[PDB]
Amino acid sequence: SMQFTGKNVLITGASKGIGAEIARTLASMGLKVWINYRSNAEVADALKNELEEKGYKAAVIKFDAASESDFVEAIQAIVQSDGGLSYLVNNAGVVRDKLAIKMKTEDFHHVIDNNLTSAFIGCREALKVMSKSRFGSVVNIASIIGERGNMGQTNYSASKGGMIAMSKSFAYEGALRNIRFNSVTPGFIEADYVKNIPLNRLGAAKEVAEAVAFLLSDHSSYITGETLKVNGGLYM
Template identity: 40%
Template sequence: MTLEGQVALVTGGSRGIGAAVCRRLAADGAAVAINYRSSEGPAKELAQEIEAAGGRAVTVHGDVADAAHAEEMVRRVTEDLGGLDILVNNAGVAQDALIYNMGMDDWLDVMRVNFGGVFHCTKAVLPHFMAKGSGVIVNVSSVMGERGWIGESNYAASKGAVNAFTRCCAMESARFGVRVNAVLPGFAPTDLVAGLTEGDTGRSIRKQIPMRRFGEVDQIAEVVRFLSGPESSYMTGSLVNVDGGAMTALGLGRP
């Protein structure tokens, strides 16, 4: 197992893409810290599932939008699991609406978690990674950060910030042996995007994806695993689309 002896912290790890990432990293030998803010039950159930399968997992509570929480999470993980080698910044929220209908703070609420969480956890983990001369950060962003979509302005802006931050952080960190990349999922059914993947809306969007189907959280987790491991050792600052070809399209849908 190529991640044997590695320790990973996955934010927002109790559900959806985060839970799939925890399972995948653990299956390849990593000890996993499952961060949660409010989903304590699912987080503990996932940890028990991983341990029952022969892996090693702990849960760690914390709100990534709070810098002090991020620092405490990193401290606890390094103490409880004996170090930290991989950070997966996955925690995210959405408050979809047309700009005209948004409240004045709707953009900030989304930005605090989606970008603030990436910044806080990266800032908290960098001294540890830099001191030991190695470390991997994988940011779970979105194709929305590179394209526009109706009703997604605050979410897309937050993910655009994550993409820009990924590139800059990669440049600053490379000389310390730290790699920073991002995964950009397209439409993959989770609680976060249920409104876009179900019913008539889901059928319409699916027709606009070249592969004519939505992604699966396990497929995204596979790419996170790749970017976390030695196979991607010459990659940093990369934004990797996992979207069924959605970003190859020009315009809205087929002619």
């Protein structure tokens, strides 16, 4: 457990994987989790059935991370459900990995608009909602690639690295009302590459979730604009 002065969190793309279990962890710490799905709701409902069976608070929502009006409408509906929003985890992510010579401009705009523009909308809405309350925390999930780069991921790396830089800029803008923006760059998360990780194992999603939790927490209070490398030593 950790302190959380805030009350609820919204987690984009949280029906499965990492997203699902940031929801699962944050709810275990007493926060109301807003699990976002984009296509099916059988799995997102199953997640909050697991949650509420365990006595935590969960609630699902449908909206495309890429869409400004859908995301904005949503954030609005959560504000008037719960009387405001406290924390955001910009998690929605997709890849289309190709060599550059085999990659077109659409294979690039997809990953940009769908990995990066979503996070821009989210952080800007964060500024908007959390200003009166003078409090909040936002965490963008980035990658190790947004830092070192990878062969075959010219679009994914651009999207993440831009996310990190923008995120620093959002931290600048949100500090004036006591809002923290930070970034988490996971390494490889669950086998050739294991030899390259010093901890000699694939990171589990619960570790990335607990890192996000520390960042949203009040144990990160003077931490803004940082980029938290959760890679087991894969990049230093």
